Structure formats: C-alpha cells, structure tokens
Amino acid sequence: CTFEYVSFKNLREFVFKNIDGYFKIYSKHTPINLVRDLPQGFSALEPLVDLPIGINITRFQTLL
Amino acid sequence: YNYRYRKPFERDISTEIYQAGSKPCNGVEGFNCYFPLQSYGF
Numbered sequence A: 001c002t003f004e005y006v007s008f009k010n011l012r013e014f015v016f017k018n019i020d021g022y023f024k025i026y027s028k029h030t031p032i033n034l035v036r037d038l039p040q041g042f043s044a045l046e047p048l049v050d051l052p053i054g055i056n057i058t059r060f061q062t063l064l
Numbered sequence B: 001y002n003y004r005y006r007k008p009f010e011r012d013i014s015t016e017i018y019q020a021g022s023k024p025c026n027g028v029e030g031f032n033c034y035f036p037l038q039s040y041g042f
Ligand SMILES: *[C@@H]1O[C@H](CO)[C@@H](O[C@@H]2O[C@H](CO)[C@@H](O)[C@H](O)[C@H]2NC(C)=O)[C@H](O)[C@H]1NC(C)=O
Pocket: A021, A054, A055, A056, B007, B008, B009, B010, B011, B012
C-alpha cells in the first residue's frame, strides 16, 4: 500500500520486469497490415517508467 | 508496541503465522506455531 502514481490494425508492444524491487516498463506502437500474428520485422521498445515499489510479483492478469 | 521486527528492498508486511514445525497452524498460536512479529522491549 506504500505507492501511487498518475501520468487489429494497431499493434502495441510492452515489456515488464521487476529487479531490485524496481518495476520497469518499456513500449512501442505501430500500425500494421499482417493482423493475424506478430509481424516479422524489427523495432526496439523504449523505456516509460522505473517504479520504486518493492513488491514480490509471480503472477499477472490482463484487464479488459 | 509500535516498534517491531520479525530479495533486496523487500517489504513483507504479512502477519501470517510461522509453521515453525510441520503443523497446519491455521492462525492458532501454540508449540511450533508462532506469530512472526515481536515488539522491541524499549
Ligand atoms: C517475498 O516473500 C518472501 C516470503 O514468502 C520473502 O522471503 C524472505 O526474503 C528475505 C530477503 O528479502 C530472505 O532473507 C529470506 O531468507 C526469505 N525468507 C524465506 C523463508 O525464504 C521476501 O522478503 C519477499 N520479497 C520481496 C521482494 O518482498
């Protein structure tokens, strides 16, 4: 409870990892034609946040 | 009573009981079933 923060044609990509209790997020966005499955090509994700949370994650779930 | 003790930068605030032996303690304190926190004798 010790933290709070506030800020098919579209493909969004993310990476989530937790290290030294910091939680790190990276992302990228692009329009696409090959909507079936991940388009073969290359584009690097870049950092968004580095949250100082100190939490013991082993599961996740998406929110629709 | 306010001042107490039991990866890096962890913060395990859980009060859940020690199974200090093989007992299914179920929050019942007793021999081999102990509450994890203690207050300092200040
Ligand atoms: C995640 O929870 C575990 C217990 O479920 C915590 O485990 C202890 O972690 C410390 C270092 O933080 C170790 O010295 C102990 O040996 C661990 N105990 C056991 C029984 O293995 C842990 O602190 C929690 N991690 C975070 C990041 O909060």
